[PDB]
């Protein structure tokens, strides 16, 4: 129960936020062109 | 031991709380998804009564599509458990004849039952429905995408709401423009379509396909929120029992506790 | 035979031998006499009483070891004597009390591994309401 | 006693465990000194289960292929894993349910439940208290019987039908009576 829930949140945040940052990695040079190295 | 003991008691005492506040949370919801039963089972009951006039033998060969409403979340008793059932029952039966089966389903707990057993045989699933109100324009794309891949015949499983404390499972045989097409269609001669019947067929089809997935999925989502209720409360009960029986060993362990140290501490005493 | 929770521990250990000894003549003699023991627990907590006065080195739950030759000298007794030794008999309807149904105990596991059988009583069946409130799948024979 | 090139003394010792506590000095010395292993259990004999054989904190050091065959030690193994798998499950099933499960871990659940009741026997000298005539059992027909229950060869059958019935045949008869 202790092990369980822990890995259980441990994975289902982990898979989330893998998502959410795979977004984010996705829309992110547009949004922020002054870190683009591609205009540096 | 003492400290397993103590945070077994700690988590399962945080599992209680969180459920009685999900069962609270889960009535809530439960109230409003009545209410929009309420206001919306009036508008699709009259057209699917009108087109089942026409009787359809579910007995009829030919390519069949299985639609299966389920959801996308857990804890919600076993409903979807019953859905996958009633959905592998037919299959196997429909499929001893010859019968080429195609799955379309709804939500990713049918997605998780039949994707071992009839993973060979999905043609669309859908998912993340319950996260907005359920509304016509969910169920619009649904029905144009089983009506794009028009089959034979279509069956729809979900589960019927008769009390917050009962529901039941059941099987529509849907009409289809090819069960269409082979009938005379001479049970509606008693209704005056204002356009002509073949004009207005098509549309009065496709609304009667758009209706049918509203009302079986509005069915299926108060079933839900009911056995969401009763599972939260069996788990608090659960979780209760657990609680207790480990308070009974976490006394019996300090008492242990108590006695060794004590123990130890007089026999260095002692032998002094 | 009474000794009371007033008496001395002495005679609480004590009462149950003399009342085996007063049974002893009827095996012997051939009559058929029962024994019942109203709680044999008191005894042991007496005896951990008089053996911790004795400056004795505890155990398990404080108890010295010798608690089990203690019970076992006491229920050894009760016997069925064959046809050549007269045809006495006598039984022994020990009584122990437990704490919240505990009988992973050390005095309950002590003396039912001494037994010849087990009559367990329930208090959910008690508040209930069936009386006597003994459960049938944990009693044996 | 030990096995010496003069004779031989197989041993079979019964060891108490106060107040079911593994970790007392006595048993814990004893584990040390033992060639093989049964650790009965309270839990599993409130189950009707008899013998109440934890096979779990059960083990030997005549179980590797090299002296039983490997398809004996792929079975024990195999079964092993599977009461493994069930154990851990346990809490969420007290918890929330076996609803909760998966597809795999319901089949789990229902062969775990089936091979623990198939593992108990009905002995000869029980019949005085329990009527039920004894059942000898051979080792092949137990690797079978295990095989089949882990293939899948027998999901079809009750869970009742495997409690004290010895091989496969019993239980097929006893599933057949229980149809009515």
Same mark, same amino acid.
């Given at each position: 129960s202790v092990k369980f829930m822990d890995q259980k949140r441990s994975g289902e945040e982990t898979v989330y936020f893998k998502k959410e940052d795979e977004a984010l990695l996705r829309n992110l040079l547009a949004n922020h062109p002054e870190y683009d190295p591609k205009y540096s | 031991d003492l400290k397993i003991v103590a945070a077994r008691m700690k988590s399962v005492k945080s599992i209680q709380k969180i459920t009685k506040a999900m069962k609270m949370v889960a009535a809530s919801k439960l109230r409003m998804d009545q209410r929009r039963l309420e206001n919306g089972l009036p508008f699709a009951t009259p057209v699917q009564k009108l087109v089942q006039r026409i009787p359809v033998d579910p007995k009829e060969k030919g390519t069949l599509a299985v639609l299966a409403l389920s959801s996308d979340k857990g804890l919600c008793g076993g409903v979807n458990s019953f859905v996958a059932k009633q959905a592998r029952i037919v299959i196997k039966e429909n499929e001893m004849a010859g019968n080429a089966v195609q799955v379309y389903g709804v939500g990713d707990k049918i997605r998780s039952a039949l994707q071992r057993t009839f993973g060979d045989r999905f043609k669309r699933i859908m998912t993340e429905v319950t996260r907005f109100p359920w509304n016509f324009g969910q169920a619009c794309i649904i029905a144009d995408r089983l009506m794009q891949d028009n089959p034979a015949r279509l069956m729809v499983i979900y589960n019927h709401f008769k009390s917050a404390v009962a529901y039941d499972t059941l099987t529509l045989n849907v009409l289809t423009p090819t069960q269409a097409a082979q009938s005379a269609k001479e049970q509606l001669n008693t209704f005056e379509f204002e356009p002509e019947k073949t004009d207005v067929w098509k549309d009065l089809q496709d609304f009667y396909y758009a209706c049918t997935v509203f009302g079986c999925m509005l069915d299926n989502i108060a079933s839900e929120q009911s056995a969401r209720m009763s599972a939260m409360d069996n788990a608090s009960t659960n979780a209760g029992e657990m609680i207790s029986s480990l308070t009974l060993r976490y006394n019996r362990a300090r008492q242990a506790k108590i006695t060794t140290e004590l123990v130890e501490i007089i026999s260095g005493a002692n032998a002094l | 035979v009474a000794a009371t929770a007033s008496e001395a521990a002495p005679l609480q250990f004590l009462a149950p031998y003399s009342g085996c000894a007063m049974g002893e003549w009827f095996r012997d003699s051939g009559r058929h006499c029962v024994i019942i023991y109203d709680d044999l627990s008191k005894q042991a907590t007496a005896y951990r009483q008089m053996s911790l006065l004795l400056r004795r080195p505890p155990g398990r739950?404080?108890?010295?070891?010798?608690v089990f030759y203690l019970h076992s000298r006491l229920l050894e007794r009760a016997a069925k004597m064959g046809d050549k030794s007269g045809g006495g008999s006598l039984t022994a309807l020990p009584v122990i009390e437990t704490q919240a149904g505990d009988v992973s105990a050390y005095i309950p596991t002590n003396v039912i591994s001494i037994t010849d059988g087990q009559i367990f009583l329930e208090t959910e069946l008690f508040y209930k309401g069936i009386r006597p409130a003994i459960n049938v799948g944990l009693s044996v024979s | 006693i030990t096995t010496t090139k003069k004779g031989s003394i197989t041993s079979v010792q019964a060891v108490y465990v106060p107040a079911d506590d593994l970790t007392d000095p006595a048993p814990a010395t004893t584990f040390a000194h033992l060639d093989a292993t049964t650790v009965l259990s309270r839990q599993i004999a409130? *189950? !009707?289960?008899?013998?109440?054989? +934890?096979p779990l904190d059960s083990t030997s050091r005549m179980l590797a292929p090299e002296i039983v065959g490997q398809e004996h030690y792929d079975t024990a193994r195999a079964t092993q894993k599977l009461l493994q798998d069930y154990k851990s499950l346990q809490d969420i099933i007290a918890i929330l !349910?076996? +609803?909760? *499960?998966s597809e795999e871990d319901k089949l789990v659940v229902s062969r775990a439940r089936k091979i623990q009741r198939f593992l108990s026997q009905p002995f000869t000298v029980a019949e005085v208290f329990t009527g039920k005539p004894g059942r000898f059992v051979e080792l092949p027909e137990t690797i079978k019987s295990a095989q089949t229950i882990l293939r899948g060869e027998c999901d079809d059958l009750p869970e009742m039908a495997f409690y004290m019935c010895g091989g496969l045949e019993e239980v097929r008869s006893k599933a057949v009576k229980m149809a009515q």
């Open positions: - | - | 739950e404080a108890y010295p070891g010798d | 409130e *189950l !009707g289960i008899y013998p109440a054989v +934890d !349910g076996m +609803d909760e *499960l």
